[PDB]
Amino acid sequence: EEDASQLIFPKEFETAETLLNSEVHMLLEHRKQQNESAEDEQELSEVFMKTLNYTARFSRFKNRETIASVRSLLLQKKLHKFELACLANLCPETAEESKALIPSLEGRFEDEELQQILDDIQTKRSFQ
Amino acid sequence: FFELIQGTEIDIFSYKPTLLTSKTLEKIRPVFDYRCMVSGSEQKFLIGLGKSQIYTWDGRQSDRWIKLDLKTELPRDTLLSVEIVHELKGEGKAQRKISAIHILDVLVLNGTDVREQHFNQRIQLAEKFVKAVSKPSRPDMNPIRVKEVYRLEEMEKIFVRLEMKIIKGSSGTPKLSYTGRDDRHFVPMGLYIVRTVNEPWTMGFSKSFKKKFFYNKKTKDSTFDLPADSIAPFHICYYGRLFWEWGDGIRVHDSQKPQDQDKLSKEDVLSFIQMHRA
Amino acid sequence: MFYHISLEHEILLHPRYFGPNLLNTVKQKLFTEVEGTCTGKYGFVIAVTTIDNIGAGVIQPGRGFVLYPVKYKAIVFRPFKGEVVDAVVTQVNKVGLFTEIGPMSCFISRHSIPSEMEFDPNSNPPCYKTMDEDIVIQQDDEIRLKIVGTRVDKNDIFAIGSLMDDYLGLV
Amino acid sequence: GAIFLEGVTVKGVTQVTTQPKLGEVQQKCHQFCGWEGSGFPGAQPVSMDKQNIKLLDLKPYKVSWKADGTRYMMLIDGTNEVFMIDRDNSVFHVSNLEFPFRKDLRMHLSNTLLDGEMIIDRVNGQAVPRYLIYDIIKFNSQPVGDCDFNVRLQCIEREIISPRHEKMKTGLIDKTQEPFSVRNKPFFDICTSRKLLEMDGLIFQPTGKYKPGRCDDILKWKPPSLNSVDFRLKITRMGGEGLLPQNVGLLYVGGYERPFAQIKVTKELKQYDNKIIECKFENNSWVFMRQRTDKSFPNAYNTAMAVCNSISNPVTKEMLFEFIDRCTA
């Protein structure tokens, strides 16, 4: 009934606002730092640890100013929240790969403008 | 673990390494007292209770012994200082990485205590042990290895084995990789510097005899043979250890840019070592 | 996708657990009850970002405990049909491929893995590799997969991914 | 319980599990004490409360300084014949410890039973084990336990010590060869406890014959500070319909079917689960001082309670002192 290839989401996931992997890393490390203080509170879930180390391994934007810059440059582009977050998380390098990993980008942007946006991603990727 | 340590203070196992920085660089003097090895994970203790009953512990009194999830076997009454290193084979999509036990130092080997033996001498017993527990007919087993130990005055030989390799999942960005004695490599985290000579002794180099000698700073005696009281036991080697971390901004291979000016490069550490060899 | 939404959940406070500070008890109760959970409609409930609104406490007639409807900003995750997601390989099998996306186990069967990526137990890690030995998918790798379908079991989702279409496999 | 003395290992001392030898050693102790039930025959002292301390005025008393030690009856039966018995009935053979007969130094003691403690001591910064002989039950089958506490006290001096000293003077005994030092605890008349006060308390010993078992007239006094009980620590999340399933540290004692008390569970307390935890009492709370690696089970219930009967209705460091001084007039 649902399909992420054509943005086919449930009605519960209509007001769903996406998050970046470095956003999830920053906020869950802030929650872990809140757990480090404010004692007589136990350790969090196994889900917390697994999600936190998972998005710590796959984090691409090492600065929150990088997060804000990518969010400002992509939010002014006519995308859905889902397409925006999936582009800024997978980070493709060719516009063919941008249309192949996300088949709902077929004809949303021009492929030269799409390659400009992907080169802006590879410009704003914090390298390791 | 309490049986095998024979009443040795547990706090000895909790000591963190001293970070090597421009403020702590003077601690590696005299250079000949030291050995070094390339690290690929955090250091842990490992206890063998026989067969697959292998447990690890992170040195903190609060931490539980965790059962090791690796297909490997160790004799009972074995107590090791180790790290866990994944050995990548090939590069990129074809790259295959296998985790391996890397012994850093040894305390007890199948009920034989070795902690009071000299670091290289303890390592000599450790090296034989890895072959003893080896299983080459069983390629499904996780390997046990001893770390390659360098003389601190030969740290230059480590950087010749550092290569920039394409690791599976690095988005095509090459990562610093240390290549071992086989066709396997791991991502290094840094370099441990371990003192092998106990105070008041230290190792000099005699320019007239072209040989290293031991010097006692208290008695002023000099000898060309190893004094028994100059031997650094496990607890002195472990307590006195430095760690030179190799994170972002540190240049140890010529393809790395940019360098952080507050962090010791290969060139800074090698220059300091060269000035203090003489 | 990692989501920042608002959710509504009702907390039941027995009068033994009122205390001098009542609202901190409700905040700790919400951070206990819904963190780390998984629901079929809202996915993996990762954490609660900010407890926005605390409702009026309706004393249930005959019952002792008070009931608080609570709105809260929350970080969650939901797996989706057809979404290409990064993943960590945990096990390579002759039947399939155990990977992880966060806390989620994902099982990629070999029958929906193309004929180039054959299985090898003879390598010292059992792995997925081609005859060119170019693409080597082994344990603790960074890969990408296309999630075909998800199955929720015992208040938690696992998923099934695939590698059939283009640009799938090792990063 | 093969730990002989905790804090050191000692040469030659060895648990005895041989079936024929052990049944003998134990049997002969029951025999020598005229003891009824199962287990340890040794006289068992009780804790001084505000009711007990009245007995120090009813008959004559002697007093000495308790040190924490381990309770061992020493059975001297022969030549290498020396054994030691636990609060537990555990039996240990001692090897190179030799007891000369006072009349004939060539002969050795037989059919002798001693009471005392094993204590570790300090001079050089290293542990020197000592056996302190605080009473004697039998000598040559002579029933010296039915004699008077000064009689028994003297006996121990000339029968078990002077002889071991003479043979040491001569080099027939190199003190060095023997597993441990051997000494008699000195005892004092009641009136001298004011000058005196690892010594953890006092012992008040009556003048009468030795009695095995629970002795209501032998009083062990501890300053109320050192009062401690050993519980098994069990922490469980406790919010079945309760809002917060906070895990709660429960304390357990031997003989009691349900929880004795509660401790507030610290972040550090947790790893001690299933293991004996040692607690003091302060604030109308229990507190964790240390861990013990020497027992897999708690104190007897009635022990815990007689700990409480002691803490709530205490005999104070000062209360005892006035009671003694008044009677010293």
Side-chain angles (χ1 to χ4, degrees), chain D residues 34-51:
Chain D
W35 171 241
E36 257 304 357
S38 186
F40 194 52
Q44 287 251 79
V46 288
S47 307
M48 189 181 263
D49 57 33
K50 283 170 193 138
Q51 267 68 235

PDB file of all heavy atoms in Angstrom, chain D residues 34-51:
ATOM      1  N   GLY D  34      31.924 -32.634  76.017  1.00  0.00           N
ATOM      2  CA  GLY D  34      30.658 -33.151  76.490  1.00  0.00           C
ATOM      3  C   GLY D  34      29.565 -32.412  75.758  1.00  0.00           C
ATOM      4  O   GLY D  34      28.687 -31.810  76.371  1.00  0.00           O
ATOM      5  N   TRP D  35      29.629 -32.447  74.432  1.00  0.00           N
ATOM      6  CA  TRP D  35      28.736 -31.647  73.614  1.00  0.00           C
ATOM      7  C   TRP D  35      27.582 -32.445  73.012  1.00  0.00           C
ATOM      8  O   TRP D  35      27.733 -33.599  72.598  1.00  0.00           O
ATOM      9  CB  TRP D  35      29.533 -30.919  72.534  1.00  0.00           C
ATOM     10  CG  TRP D  35      28.719 -30.215  71.472  1.00  0.00           C
ATOM     11  CD1 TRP D  35      28.739 -30.467  70.126  1.00  0.00           C
ATOM     12  CD2 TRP D  35      27.786 -29.146  71.660  1.00  0.00           C
ATOM     13  NE1 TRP D  35      27.879 -29.619  69.469  1.00  0.00           N
ATOM     14  CE2 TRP D  35      27.281 -28.802  70.384  1.00  0.00           C
ATOM     15  CE3 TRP D  35      27.326 -28.451  72.777  1.00  0.00           C
ATOM     16  CZ2 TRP D  35      26.346 -27.791  70.203  1.00  0.00           C
ATOM     17  CZ3 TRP D  35      26.398 -27.450  72.591  1.00  0.00           C
ATOM     18  CH2 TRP D  35      25.917 -27.129  71.313  1.00  0.00           C
ATOM     19  N   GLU D  36      26.433 -31.780  72.951  1.00  0.00           N
ATOM     20  CA  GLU D  36      25.164 -32.387  72.586  1.00  0.00           C
ATOM     21  C   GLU D  36      24.919 -32.521  71.087  1.00  0.00           C
ATOM     22  O   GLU D  36      24.987 -33.623  70.534  1.00  0.00           O
ATOM     23  CB  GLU D  36      24.027 -31.561  73.203  1.00  0.00           C
ATOM     24  CG  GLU D  36      23.418 -32.194  74.439  1.00  0.00           C
ATOM     25  CD  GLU D  36      22.908 -33.614  74.176  1.00  0.00           C
ATOM     26  OE1 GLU D  36      22.976 -34.071  73.010  1.00  0.00           O
ATOM     27  OE2 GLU D  36      22.437 -34.272  75.134  1.00  0.00           O
ATOM     28  N   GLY D  37      24.645 -31.387  70.443  1.00  0.00           N
ATOM     29  CA  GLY D  37      24.149 -31.370  69.079  1.00  0.00           C
ATOM     30  C   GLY D  37      25.178 -31.603  67.989  1.00  0.00           C
ATOM     31  O   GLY D  37      26.280 -32.097  68.229  1.00  0.00           O
ATOM     32  N   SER D  38      24.777 -31.279  66.766  1.00  0.00           N
ATOM     33  CA  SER D  38      25.665 -31.312  65.612  1.00  0.00           C
ATOM     34  C   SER D  38      26.524 -30.047  65.512  1.00  0.00           C
ATOM     35  O   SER D  38      26.160 -28.984  66.029  1.00  0.00           O
ATOM     36  CB  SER D  38      24.850 -31.500  64.328  1.00  0.00           C
ATOM     37  OG  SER D  38      25.695 -31.665  63.198  1.00  0.00           O
ATOM     38  N   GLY D  39      27.664 -30.167  64.843  1.00  0.00           N
ATOM     39  CA  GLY D  39      28.483 -29.008  64.543  1.00  0.00           C
ATOM     40  C   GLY D  39      29.538 -28.685  65.582  1.00  0.00           C
ATOM     41  O   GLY D  39      30.033 -29.565  66.296  1.00  0.00           O
ATOM     42  N   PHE D  40      29.881 -27.401  65.647  1.00  0.00           N
ATOM     43  CA  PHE D  40      30.927 -26.868  66.523  1.00  0.00           C
ATOM     44  C   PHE D  40      30.528 -26.925  68.005  1.00  0.00           C
ATOM     45  O   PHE D  40      29.471 -26.442  68.390  1.00  0.00           O
ATOM     46  CB  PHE D  40      31.259 -25.434  66.082  1.00  0.00           C
ATOM     47  CG  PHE D  40      32.523 -24.881  66.669  1.00  0.00           C
ATOM     48  CD1 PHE D  40      33.713 -25.580  66.584  1.00  0.00           C
ATOM     49  CD2 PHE D  40      32.529 -23.650  67.274  1.00  0.00           C
ATOM     50  CE1 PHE D  40      34.877 -25.060  67.115  1.00  0.00           C
ATOM     51  CE2 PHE D  40      33.693 -23.129  67.801  1.00  0.00           C
ATOM     52  CZ  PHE D  40      34.863 -23.831  67.720  1.00  0.00           C
ATOM     53  N   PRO D  41      31.354 -27.585  68.823  1.00  0.00           N
ATOM     54  CA  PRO D  41      31.222 -27.700  70.278  1.00  0.00           C
ATOM     55  C   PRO D  41      31.619 -26.434  71.023  1.00  0.00           C
ATOM     56  O   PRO D  41      31.230 -26.271  72.177  1.00  0.00           O
ATOM     57  CB  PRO D  41      32.207 -28.805  70.621  1.00  0.00           C
ATOM     58  CG  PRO D  41      33.276 -28.631  69.632  1.00  0.00           C
ATOM     59  CD  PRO D  41      32.625 -28.152  68.354  1.00  0.00           C
ATOM     60  N   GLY D  42      32.412 -25.580  70.381  1.00  0.00           N
ATOM     61  CA  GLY D  42      33.053 -24.468  71.060  1.00  0.00           C
ATOM     62  C   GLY D  42      32.067 -23.561  71.757  1.00  0.00           C
ATOM     63  O   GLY D  42      30.980 -23.301  71.238  1.00  0.00           O
ATOM     64  N   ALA D  43      32.437 -23.086  72.939  1.00  0.00           N
ATOM     65  CA  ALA D  43      31.636 -22.104  73.646  1.00  0.00           C
ATOM     66  C   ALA D  43      31.372 -20.899  72.738  1.00  0.00           C
ATOM     67  O   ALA D  43      32.285 -20.375  72.112  1.00  0.00           O
ATOM     68  CB  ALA D  43      32.358 -21.666  74.888  1.00  0.00           C
ATOM     69  N   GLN D  44      30.126 -20.451  72.673  1.00  0.00           N
ATOM     70  CA  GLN D  44      29.761 -19.293  71.865  1.00  0.00           C
ATOM     71  C   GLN D  44      29.335 -18.079  72.712  1.00  0.00           C
ATOM     72  O   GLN D  44      28.353 -18.149  73.443  1.00  0.00           O
ATOM     73  CB  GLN D  44      28.617 -19.689  70.936  1.00  0.00           C
ATOM     74  CG  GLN D  44      29.014 -20.587  69.779  1.00  0.00           C
ATOM     75  CD  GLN D  44      28.970 -19.833  68.466  1.00  0.00           C
ATOM     76  OE1 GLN D  44      29.893 -19.073  68.146  1.00  0.00           O
ATOM     77  NE2 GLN D  44      27.881 -20.012  67.709  1.00  0.00           N
ATOM     78  N   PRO D  45      30.077 -16.966  72.629  1.00  0.00           N
ATOM     79  CA  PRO D  45      29.759 -15.785  73.435  1.00  0.00           C
ATOM     80  C   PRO D  45      28.572 -15.047  72.854  1.00  0.00           C
ATOM     81  O   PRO D  45      28.222 -15.351  71.726  1.00  0.00           O
ATOM     82  CB  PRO D  45      31.034 -14.928  73.330  1.00  0.00           C
ATOM     83  CG  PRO D  45      32.072 -15.828  72.794  1.00  0.00           C
ATOM     84  CD  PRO D  45      31.321 -16.765  71.887  1.00  0.00           C
ATOM     85  N   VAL D  46      27.968 -14.129  73.608  1.00  0.00           N
ATOM     86  CA  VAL D  46      26.853 -13.314  73.117  1.00  0.00           C
ATOM     87  C   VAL D  46      27.094 -11.803  73.271  1.00  0.00           C
ATOM     88  O   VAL D  46      27.910 -11.367  74.066  1.00  0.00           O
ATOM     89  CB  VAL D  46      25.527 -13.702  73.789  1.00  0.00           C
ATOM     90  CG1 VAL D  46      25.070 -15.023  73.279  1.00  0.00           C
ATOM     91  CG2 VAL D  46      25.678 -13.760  75.284  1.00  0.00           C
ATOM     92  N   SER D  47      26.378 -11.002  72.495  1.00  0.00           N
ATOM     93  CA  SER D  47      26.584  -9.559  72.518  1.00  0.00           C
ATOM     94  C   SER D  47      25.953  -8.883  73.722  1.00  0.00           C
ATOM     95  O   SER D  47      24.783  -9.122  74.048  1.00  0.00           O
ATOM     96  CB  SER D  47      26.055  -8.904  71.246  1.00  0.00           C
ATOM     97  OG  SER D  47      26.606  -9.543  70.117  1.00  0.00           O
ATOM     98  N   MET D  48      26.757  -8.029  74.356  1.00  0.00           N
ATOM     99  CA  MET D  48      26.358  -7.233  75.496  1.00  0.00           C
ATOM    100  C   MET D  48      25.247  -6.266  75.121  1.00  0.00           C
ATOM    101  O   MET D  48      25.345  -5.514  74.143  1.00  0.00           O
ATOM    102  CB  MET D  48      27.562  -6.463  76.012  1.00  0.00           C
ATOM    103  CG  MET D  48      27.322  -5.769  77.319  1.00  0.00           C
ATOM    104  SD  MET D  48      28.807  -4.888  77.778  1.00  0.00           S
ATOM    105  CE  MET D  48      29.592  -6.033  78.906  1.00  0.00           C
ATOM    106  N   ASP D  49      24.177  -6.302  75.901  1.00  0.00           N
ATOM    107  CA  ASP D  49      23.077  -5.358  75.739  1.00  0.00           C
ATOM    108  C   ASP D  49      22.877  -4.676  77.099  1.00  0.00           C
ATOM    109  O   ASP D  49      23.630  -4.954  78.040  1.00  0.00           O
ATOM    110  CB  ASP D  49      21.806  -6.077  75.253  1.00  0.00           C
ATOM    111  CG  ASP D  49      21.363  -7.204  76.196  1.00  0.00           C
ATOM    112  OD1 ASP D  49      21.551  -7.084  77.416  1.00  0.00           O
ATOM    113  OD2 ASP D  49      20.813  -8.216  75.731  1.00  0.00           O
ATOM    114  N   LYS D  50      21.894  -3.790  77.218  1.00  0.00           N
ATOM    115  CA  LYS D  50      21.646  -3.151  78.501  1.00  0.00           C
ATOM    116  C   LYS D  50      21.179  -4.137  79.591  1.00  0.00           C
ATOM    117  O   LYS D  50      21.284  -3.841  80.776  1.00  0.00           O
ATOM    118  CB  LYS D  50      20.696  -1.953  78.354  1.00  0.00           C
ATOM    119  CG  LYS D  50      21.349  -0.699  77.785  1.00  0.00           C
ATOM    120  CD  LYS D  50      20.322   0.393  77.436  1.00  0.00           C
ATOM    121  CE  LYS D  50      20.937   1.528  76.561  1.00  0.00           C
ATOM    122  NZ  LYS D  50      20.060   2.014  75.422  1.00  0.00           N
ATOM    123  N   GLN D  51      20.679  -5.308  79.204  1.00  0.00           N
ATOM    124  CA  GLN D  51      20.334  -6.364  80.181  1.00  0.00           C
ATOM    125  C   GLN D  51      21.503  -7.239  80.685  1.00  0.00           C
ATOM    126  O   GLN D  51      21.563  -7.577  81.864  1.00  0.00           O
ATOM    127  CB  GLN D  51      19.220  -7.281  79.648  1.00  0.00           C
ATOM    128  CG  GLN D  51      17.798  -6.876  80.051  1.00  0.00           C
ATOM    129  CD  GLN D  51      17.328  -5.562  79.401  1.00  0.00           C
ATOM    130  OE1 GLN D  51      16.919  -4.628  80.107  1.00  0.00           O
ATOM    131  NE2 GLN D  51      17.370  -5.495  78.052  1.00  0.00           N
TER     132      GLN D  51
END
